[PDB]
Amino acid sequence: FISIKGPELLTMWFGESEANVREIFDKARQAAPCVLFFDELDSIAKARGGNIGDGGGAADRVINQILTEMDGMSTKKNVFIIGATNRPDIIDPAILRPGRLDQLIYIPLPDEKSRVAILKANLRKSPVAKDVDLEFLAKMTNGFSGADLTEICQRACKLAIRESIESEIVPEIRRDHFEEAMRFARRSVSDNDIRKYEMFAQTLQ
Amino acid sequence: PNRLIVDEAINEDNSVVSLSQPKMDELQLFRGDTVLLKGKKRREAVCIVLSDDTCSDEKIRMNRVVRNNLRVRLGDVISIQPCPDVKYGKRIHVLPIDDTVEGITGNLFEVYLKPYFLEAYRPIRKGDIFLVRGGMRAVEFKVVETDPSPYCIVAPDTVIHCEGEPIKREDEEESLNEVGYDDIGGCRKQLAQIKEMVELPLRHPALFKAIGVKPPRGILLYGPPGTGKTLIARAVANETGAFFFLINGPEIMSKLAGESESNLRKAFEEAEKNAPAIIFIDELDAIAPKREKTHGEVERRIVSQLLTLMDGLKQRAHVIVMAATNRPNSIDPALRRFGRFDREVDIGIPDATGRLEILQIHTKNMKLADDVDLEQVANETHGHVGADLAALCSEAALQAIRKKMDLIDLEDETIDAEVMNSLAVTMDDFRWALSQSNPSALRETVVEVPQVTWEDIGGLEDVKRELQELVQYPVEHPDKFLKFGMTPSKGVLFYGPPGCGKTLLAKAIANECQANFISIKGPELLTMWFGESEANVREIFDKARQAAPCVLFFDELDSIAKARGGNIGDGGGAADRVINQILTEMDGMSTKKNVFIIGATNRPDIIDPAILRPGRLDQLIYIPLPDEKSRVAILKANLRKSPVAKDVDLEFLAKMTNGFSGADLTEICQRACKLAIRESIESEIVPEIRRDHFEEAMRFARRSVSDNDIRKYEMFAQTLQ
Amino acid sequence: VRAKLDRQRRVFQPSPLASQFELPGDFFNLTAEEIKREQRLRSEAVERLSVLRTKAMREKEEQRGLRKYNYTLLRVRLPDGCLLQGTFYARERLGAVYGFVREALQSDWLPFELLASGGQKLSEDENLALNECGLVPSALLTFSWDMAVLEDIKAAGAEPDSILKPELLSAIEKLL
Amino acid sequence: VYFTCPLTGATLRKDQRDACIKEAILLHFSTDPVAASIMKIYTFNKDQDRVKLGVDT
Ligand SMILES: Nc1ncnc2c1ncn2[C@@H]1O[C@H](COP(=O)(O)OP(=O)(O)O)[C@@H](O)[C@H]1O
Ligand SMILES: Nc1ncnc2c1ncn2[C@@H]1O[C@H](COP(=O)(O)OP(=O)(O)O)[C@@H](O)[C@H]1O
């Protein structure tokens, strides 16, 4: 797995060193079988102002080198390229043409049964009391993302740790710590953004 | 029993040693009793025993004068044998050592020996060497005759005699003018770090002889020129007794091909022949500059010879090689690979305390006038290094010499001791020299422990506690963090209105931790952005590690976002070259490096959100405008340094200044101070700040944070809580 | 009602034989056991300077050292080679030491001075406590007659060969 | 450390001080009960601020 994160795509863009894209794809050819993941493909568009920016198009030096290398890569090398973006409305549409990332998958906010699964997975690292009703929490966190459920898990953990330390101046996270965490935790994706994401996915059918 | 390990002394007096009180209790001796110390080569010394709160139970603290008389060095062992039978002396004959009395003549008794022993009751033994300072000269004397033997206590009734030629020093005895640890002022920690790295492989090499793991072979000292890099290397060699072999770039580089390599490898051969030995290579960046910067045969060939000689140290047992450079990145990277020069120490720039210590060292021989205050000098000499403080003391001495020598009119081959004894250096001569001196380290970043303490910050009682907990809890309860799978945070972001104490909070926690404070301001982040030199961010984080324990404070995180518009906006977004490198470096910092990273912004809505992702500034503290009781505390803190009349009602001011920040309350205080000064000057051509001065100040002082700006911060604070 | 602290005034005579001792050469050879404690303290000293710790943690280290002593045993070295010793509370005033010495002197009316172990003069008129003077939990004081009377003693040819009363000297003990 | 008992003249150590003086005060009741109880009020009670308030009342 080759992890190319936003800051790496931004570093090449900012310094006008898009030639380094060839070395990234060379790693994929030599590391095969491999999965080449380009995270935050819109990081440059956002670094260009995102919602407004300049008057130019979505194409830039880094993505153009990526598109070139993809066209020169055969499926016979056992290399599969995955992208991710949270702002598809500003991504260079060339990446979705045949021969590139032609497949599109929409990943919605998790539903009730998935949010419970996320809370249970995130809490595998800490002792949690049996009084904690994770299904009740999932029912309330209807608009929360998986990243937001993690903050709830960590916030309740922080409270349990603080109380344990103070008791010597406790053995597990109690329901009160999760209910208190719910007083500060917020969804990172607003209702306006949820509708925008759903309407975009609907437009693509 | 009754055998202790020799350590360094704090007391500057040459006739005393310090023991830990429980050992004085076991020996049934009291503070002030005279004891004998048994050293090496069937020698002994007599001294007075005291005690302090810092000596280890199993150590004896004695200075260089006492250690040399016993022919012992730090880490050796001596025996203590009380000698209460010592009697008062009747006549002692003392003569100077020729090596230190040259070019000077006069009545040495009146200048040196008389005030030295005057009501001091120092123990004296035949054959002892002791040091007396004065007249800008360090003169040491040998005792050649004592009426009682072999030792006695000097008394006011003891005859002190001194007739005869100066004595030639024995070749087995070292001069007291040689550099040692007592000649080093600031950077005490770096010296302690070197002690651990150097004493072990040279004193206890057998730990590595049998085991398959080789010791560190090289130590690279770096920092601005004139900070003592060479001084430390020499002092360590002298204190441990190793042979010191001096190498420097220019000496090798000035030679032709063949001659340069011959001299370099000859030094290594001599270091082995005379082992234990320390090889000090100065200006390492001159002998071994970056390869991509040079194409000459000598510049590359001498590096190959050095690399082979360093690797050959596996056979050259008991030899360590030290080197000095200006920066760790100015030398051929091959030298810094495991083995060779794998360990390095940042000497840095002395702070206000270190500068005072350095001045006190250089003035040891100087007769300072009563008006001289070296602490005032140390506070003014910002940006100076030890090389500049040495020049400062010399210039102050020369100014005093000219002023009095023009009146003395002594033209001869020698100088009278009496006229030097009466030559005092006044504060005007130091102030004059300060105006003529120019710091050599004014461009380099100065990192020191800040002077801001918790008493200087009004309000924010809960933030003060939170910052303390973030420091003690990760080490007072590591089992509770591990039990719950929680990683302690290593940084915090402060946000809110300007002028509320964001910087003071970072300094105050550094102060109370006694940690170094590294201040990065907007202009520095902007300089790296504008100049496309974001690579320098790595140097900032590397400084934080070397300065640990330290607080790494990144102020004005929004400086670049605002430079790109902030309220309007150009063609860019939130990310930039500098913040991207900062985020990358943060991910490499471990919680065990004793570095606490603090950020601050006045516009948290336009800072790259990545800074708050897990592993970065995970703690987030809001700093609101002070409330009524806090504003009173702020006014009292701001006025702490000035006289304030009893008619000044600080609560009344706080009640009115509802929208004022802490910085705005300072403007009121400073205006009232200026007005009090103006009135005093007018009356001379009143001694305390009166309510009239504060009421007039209120006519101009205004709140800098509007109601709309307060809501802007509330919206962000409620979003992330 | 509180028991009066008994000064237990004594005069001692040192025995020159206590200072006669010879060490074999191997007595100065540092052992591996001592090297382990010395090397441990070297690493601990660097670790102390290295740690980021708040003042509350620093207090716990200081507090370990601080609170032991509430008494003192003082000794005075006299010009005649005798040692005068007595016991005091740590908060006792310097004036009690003068009185203690005056009661032991052959001539209690003859002006004298007591100097501390560092050469600092202790003035009889300065009502400071022994724990404030640096004379706790033990100290040796230096006795000397006032210079005014020393000039008359020397000018008359009188050797001051007895400092203390024969009443105490008849009970002089050797140091053991 | 040695101490003299002002009521008996006995030589005491640091640990024997209160034991001998308290005994001498309790024995003194056979000669002068008022003087013995006065010594007991000031001597036995470690809290002198309460003794001053008790005596004044
Ligand atoms: N930290 C320090 N403490 C005391 N003296 C110092 C210190 N740093 C420099 N000095 C003084 O400044 C001078 C430094 O010159 P030198 O010995 O050539 O070393 P370097 O040039 O490597 O600093 C010496 O006179 C030294 O005593
Ligand atoms: N909470 C406070 N307590 C006392 N003084 C304050 C406080 N906040 C601000 N000040 C005053 O404002 C001045 C600037 O504070 P500073 O921390 O530099 O602000 P900033 O962090 O916004 O740069 C200080 O000199 C101080 O006197």
Numbering used by the authors:
A (entry chain A): 539 to 707, 728 to 763
B (entry chain F): 23 to 707, 728 to 763
C (entry chain G): 266 to 441
D (entry chain G): 121 to 177
Paper excerpt:
p97, also known as valosin-containing protein, is an essential cytosolic AAA+ (ATPases associated with diverse cellular activities) hexamer that unfolds substrate polypeptides to support protein homeostasis and macromolecular disassembly. p97 forms homohexamers that enclose a central channel through which substrates are translocated and unfolded; each protomer consists of two AAA+ ATPase domains (D1 and D2), an N-terminal domain (NTD) and an unstructured C-terminal tail. Here we identify UBXD1 as a potent p97 ATPase inhibitor and report structures of intact human p97–UBXD1 complexes that reveal extensive UBXD1 contacts across p97 and an asymmetric remodeling of the hexamer.
In p97–UBXD1closed, D1 and D2 are in a planar conformation and one molecule of UBXD1 is identified, binding across protomers P1 and P6. In the closed state, the D1 domains of P1 and P6 are separated by 3 Å relative to p97ADP, while there is negligible D2 separation. In p97–UBXD1closed, the D1 domains are more separated than the D2 domains, probably owing to lariat binding. The 18-residue VIM helix is positioned in the NTD cleft of P1, similar to structures of isolated domains, and comprises the only major contact with this protomer. The UBX domain is bound to the NTD of P6 in a manner similar to that of other adaptors despite mutation of the canonical phenylalanine–proline–arginine motif8 located on the S3/S4 loop to serine–glycine–glycine. The UBXD1 helical lariat is among the most striking UBXD1 binding elements owing to its intimate interaction with all three domains of the P6 protomer. This domain is composed of four helices (Lα1–Lα4) inserted between Uβ0 and Uβ1 of the UBX domain that completely encircle the P6 NTD. Lα3 is situated at the D1 interface of P6 and P1 and makes electrostatic contacts with residues in both the N-terminal and D1 domains of P6; in the closed state hydrophobic contacts are also made with the D1 domain of P1. In summary, we identify that a single molecule of UBXD1 surprisingly interacts across three p97 protomers (P1, P5 and P6) through interactions by the VIM, UBX and PUB domains.
